[PDB]
């Protein structure tokens, strides 16, 4: 009887605790399930997920092993592959999210053999006893990466079942699979790391690793990335890893503060008067707001599935602070455009940028949008690639008056906030 290895958002061989835990007991057969709960989403993200599954099978086939791919509900398909293979047990990485817990609960009932879950590799775990809303106190618990675990060398032979359907992403995708992801990481650590801390805030995002699409499906392990930056060492190295830590902190917050997915973390913002308004939602959404910097950001995201940290925090704050659009609508639509879109992380971003209480980011911080453009794109190159309509970051029949609206937010917000 083979042990099944059930890969969810961990489409990799390297640093894979459930894969090893099973491999030491006996022969294995991996399984993915294409779950409608994750895959009724935009074409770009269905394809990104599916092509990474496809690369994961190529990775098994290449080491001589077997990856089933089945389609439908996990509590209906994990048991089916259990019966059809006669597995003695199934292995997977714990998920501390509300769907994770629900699916994993349901699978464990329908399975007649054990379901053994193992800690996913993290820099810091999301389910620690104490609850922090501030990053600094949280980041202090971190002492440096533990060593990552090897990949298998060669996998045992097993029968293979399932089709990986092919979907139109609608746009150009990165190279799928952990062979592409580990090449990308080593180029990055080798060519850009020294300057990361000087370069992280450009609008073109070209001083960073561009590896988020991979970290989102677990195609690259955050403990391998950190451990490796820690070996290279130097200055870039500390700051890059501090960013990986902002990803773990995003899961930390959503775990301890679940209601955060419904409402601002800061109680003082729970009654803020958003003004739904279709006309305006559409112009933010489609980058037609008249603000060079927001329409570049919104238009790159549409065409590419990717956006830099500094464009995102601008594009996202603008909706909340200058347009006063309701966060849930926006932040949903945002995450659907992103290959790397990740519920907790995108929520943490919206709550930070939007001044609703991640890390005590103060309401008063309002991006001046032309300023933001002059400090983070020094001779225009970015703005000309994504909206050459605009001759500079000077706004051009903006859908609101910026100061009227800066002055507006600061006003509504100072009552609420400290009144
Ligand atoms: C409005 C908002 C929404 C966002 N939504 C998401 C999302 O859905 N999925 C997502 O991956 N990132 C999201 N981010 C966080 C961050 O912007 C991106 O992960 C970063 O742009 C990825 O580019 P990079 O791979 O070059 O990062 P790098 O600069 O190379 O950073 C290394 C890695 O650390 C992690 N990281 C970096 N910055 C952050 C951050 N601010 N918070 C959490 N993790 C971070 C990422 O996994 C990143 O790939 C969002 C940020 C904001 C402001
Ligand atoms: C765009 C996208 C699509 C995904 N599709 C998944 C799927 O079809 N099956 C699955 O097991 N995991 C899927 N994952 C990861 C799930 O979110 C998973 O339940 C999480 O890893 C909990 O383990 C998934 C993630 C993302 I972004
Ligand atoms: Cl157990
Ligand atoms: Cl280890």
From Swiss-Prot:
Composition bias type Basic and acidic residues, residue spans: 158-169
Residue ranges of domain Photolyase/cryptochrome alpha/beta in the record: 1-123
A Pfam family hit: FAD_binding_7
Binding, DNA: 200, 372
InterPro entries (UniProt xref): Crypto/Photolyase_FAD-like_sf (IPR036134), Crypto/Photolyase_N_sf (IPR036155), Cryptochr/Photolyase_FAD-bd (IPR005101), Cryptochrome/DNA_photolyase_1 (IPR002081), DNA_photolyase_1_CS_C (IPR018394), DNA_photolyase_N (IPR006050), Rossmann-like_a/b/a_fold (IPR014729)
Domain of life, source organism: Bacteria
Annotated site (Electron transfer via tryptophanyl radical): 274, 327, 350
Segments for region (Interaction with DNA): 243-250, 309-310
Details of cofactor binding: Binds 1 FAD per subunit.
Gene3D superfamilies linked to this entry: 1.25.40.80, DNA Cyclobutane Dipyrimidine Photolyase, subunit A, domain 3, HUPs
Effect of residue 352 to A: Strongly reduces interaction with DNA. Reduces CPD repair activity by 80%
Keywords, in A-Z order: Chromophore, DNA damage, DNA repair, DNA-binding, FAD, Flavoprotein, Lyase, Nucleotide-binding, Plasmid
Cofactor(s) needed by this chain: FAD
Disordered, as annotated region: 146-175
GO biological process: DNA repair; response to light stimulus
Catalytic activity: cyclobutadipyrimidine (in DNA) = 2 pyrimidine residues (in DNA)
Effect of residue 246 to A: Reduces CPD repair activity by 20%
Chain residues that bind FAD: 196, 208-212, 240, 247, 309, 340-342
Keyword Flavoprotein: yes
The UniProt record lists the keyword Phosphoprotein: no
Single GO molecular function: DNA binding
Quaternary structure annotation from Swiss-Prot or TrEMBL: Monomer.
Entry similarity comment: Belongs to the DNA photolyase class-1 family.
Function: Involved in repair of UV radiation-induced DNA damage. Catalyzes the light-dependent monomerization (300-600 nm) of cyclobutyl pyrimidine dimers (in cis-syn configuration), which are formed between adjacent bases on the same DNA strand upon exposure to ultraviolet radiation.
Protein name as catalogued: Deoxyribodipyrimidine photo-lyase
Name of the gene: phr
């Amino acid at each position: 009887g083979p042990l099944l290895v059930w890969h969810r958002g961990d489409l990799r061989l390297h640093d894979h605790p459930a894969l090893l835990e099973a491999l030491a007991r006996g022969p294995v057969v991996g399984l993915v399930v294409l779950d409608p709960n994750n895959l009724k989403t935009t074409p770009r993200r269905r394809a990104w997920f599916l092509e990474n599954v496809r690369a994961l099978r190529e990775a098994y086939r290449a080491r001589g092993g077997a990856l089933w791919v089945l389609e439908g509900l996990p509590w209906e398909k994990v048991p089916e592959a259990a019966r059809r293979l006669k597995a003695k047990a199934v292995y997977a990485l714990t998920s501390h999210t509300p769907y994770g817990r629900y699916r994993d609960g349901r699978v464990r009932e329908a399975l007649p053999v054990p379901l053994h879950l193992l800690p996913a590799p993290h820099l810091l775990p999301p389910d620690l006893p104490r609850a922090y809303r501030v990053y600094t106190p949280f980041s202090r618990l971190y002492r440096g990466a533990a060593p990552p675990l090897p990949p298998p060398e060669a996998l045992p032979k097993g029968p293979e079942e399932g089709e990986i359907p092919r979907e139109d992403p609608g746009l150009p995708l990165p190279e799928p699979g952990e062979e592409a992801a580990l090449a990308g990481l080593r180029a990055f650590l080798e060519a850009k790391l020294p300057r990361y801390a000087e370069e992280r805030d450009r609008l073109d995002g070209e001083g960073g690793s561009r590896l988020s699409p991979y970290f989102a499906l677990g195609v690259l392990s955050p403990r391998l990335a950190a451990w490796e930056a820690e070996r290279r060492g130097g200055e870039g190295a500390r700051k890059w890893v501090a960013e990986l830590l902002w990803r773990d902190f995003s899961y930390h917050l959503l775990y301890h503060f679940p209601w955060m997915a419904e409402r601002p973390l800061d109680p003082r913002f729970q009654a803020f008067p958003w003004q739904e308004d279709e006309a305006l939602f559409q112009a933010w959404y489609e980058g037609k707001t008249g603000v060079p910097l927001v329409d570049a950001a919104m238009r790159e995201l549409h065409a590419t599935g990717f956006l830099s940290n500094r464009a995102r925090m601008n594009a996202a704050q603008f909706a909340v602070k200058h347009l006063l659009l309701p966060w849930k609508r926006c932040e949903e639509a945002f995450r659907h455009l992103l290959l790397d879109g990740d519920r907790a992380v995108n929520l943490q971003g919206w709550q930070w940028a939007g001044g609703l209480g991640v890390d005590a980011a103060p309401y008063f911080r309002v991006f001046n949008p032309v300023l933001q453009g002059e400090r983070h794109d020094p001779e225009g190159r970015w703005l000309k690639r994504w909206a050459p309509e605009y001759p500079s970051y000077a706004p051009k029949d903006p859908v609101v008056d910026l100061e009227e609206a800066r002055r507006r937010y600061l006003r509504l917000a100072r009552d609420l906030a400290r009144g």
